[PDB]
């Protein structure tokens, strides 16, 4: 998962 | 510091607390961007991805920026302006992040980058609005984007948000  | 600024800081802390009790994954299943076309009519998911954070330092970092800049928009341009920046930017930064890397992403930085874009451009083209971003921070913002290219970030969210915030700021600095 990626951090926005 | 007004109603929409605090309502969103409460939502993010409430959802963050639930992720610690239920686990990240359990909340992710219900709040993340649709991973399956069949789920497309679950309206909330287009927005809810923005409330989810994965560590304390990113929630802190994000909500603080949301306070500084979001509070500035609400104070000077009113609650309806901050709502519309938030909804449009969350939907579109979501949409772009999904295409780049798929639906497993979260955080308010999509919205934050649209805020940094709107507050900077609006304060340069319509200074009379009463909002502005320091050049010391437009350097921090740009270094933040590029440090995501060279690396755990949602790069599509970052750049789609920023673009949204320049677009809207530009339009609003004609109507002025």
């Amino acid at each position: 998962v990626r951090m926005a | 510091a007004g109603p929409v600024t605090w309502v969103m800081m409460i939502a993010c802390v409430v959802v963050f607390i639930a992720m610690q009790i239920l686990g990240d994954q359990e909340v992710m299943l219900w709040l993340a961007w649709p991973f399956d076309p069949t789920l497309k009519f679950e309206f909330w998911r287009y927005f809810t991805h923005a409330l989810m954070h994965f560590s304390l330092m990113h929630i802190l970092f994000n909500l603080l920026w949301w306070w500084y800049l979001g509070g500035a928009v609400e104070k000077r341009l009113g609650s309806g302006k901050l709502i519309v920046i938030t909804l449009i930017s969350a939907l579109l930064s979501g949409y772009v992040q999904q295409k780049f890397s798929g639906p497993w992403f979260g955080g308010l930085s999509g919205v934050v980058f649209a805020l940094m874009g709107y507050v900077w451009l609006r304060g340069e083209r319509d200074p009379q609005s009463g909002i502005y971003l320091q050049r010391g921070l437009i350097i921090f913002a740009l270094i933040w984007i590029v440090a995501g290219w060279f690396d755990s970030m949602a790069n599509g969210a970052h750049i789609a948000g920023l673009a949204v915030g320049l677009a809207m700021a530009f339009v609003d600095s004609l109507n002025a």
Side-chain angles (χ1 to χ4, degrees):
Chain A
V1 301
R2 311 191 174 261
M3 332 268 137
Chain B
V4 176
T5 307
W6 287 94
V7 160
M8 247 266 179
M9 290 171 79
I10 291 312
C12 287
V13 163
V14 155
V15 157
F16 185 67
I17 290 164
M19 292 174 88
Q20 256 58 17
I21 297 167
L22 287 178
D24 283 342
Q25 281 149 57
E26 171 50 24
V27 171
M28 249 192 291
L29 283 177
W30 283 100
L31 304 185
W33 194 275
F35 89 94
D36 187 321
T38 317
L39 301 177
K40 72 190 193 280
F41 295 116
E42 294 189 357
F43 304 138
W44 60 94
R45 297 180 172 278
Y46 301 119
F47 312 101
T48 53
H49 61 88
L51 304 168
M52 292 189 286
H53 296 83
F54 305 98
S55 57
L56 215 125
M57 334 287 150
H58 296 153
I59 184 185
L60 286 170
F61 192 61
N62 274 356
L63 264 197
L64 172 134
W65 272 108
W66 162 266
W67 172 88
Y68 182 70
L69 299 167
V73 168
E74 190 166 29
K75 201 197 106 178
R76 317 275 318 167
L77 305 177
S79 287
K81 185 52 74 194
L82 181 64
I83 287 169
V84 167
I85 292 171
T86 295
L87 290 181
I88 291 172
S89 67
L91 167 62
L92 303 186
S93 65
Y95 182 82
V96 168
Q97 185 48 46
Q98 179 263 320
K99 296 295 201 170
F100 271 41
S101 277
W104 306 121
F105 65 92
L108 191 61
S109 75
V111 167
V112 155
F113 269 97
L115 292 174
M116 278 189 286
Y118 188 100
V119 174
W120 172 74
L121 190 155
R122 191 77 197 258
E124 288 261 28
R125 289 190 28 109
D126 179 28
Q128 254 166 311
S129 63
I131 58 162
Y132 95 117
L133 194 68
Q134 279 113 306
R135 264 191 51 162
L137 305 179
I138 90 146
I139 69 106
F140 189 85
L142 281 176
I143 292 307
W144 184 11
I145 227 162
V146 303
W149 294 342
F150 308 109
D151 239 89
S152 198
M153 292 179 209
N155 295 311
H158 276 181
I159 196 152
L162 193 53
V164 169
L166 300 170
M168 287 180 77
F170 184 90
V171 188
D172 291 357
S173 290
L174 300 153
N175 286 343

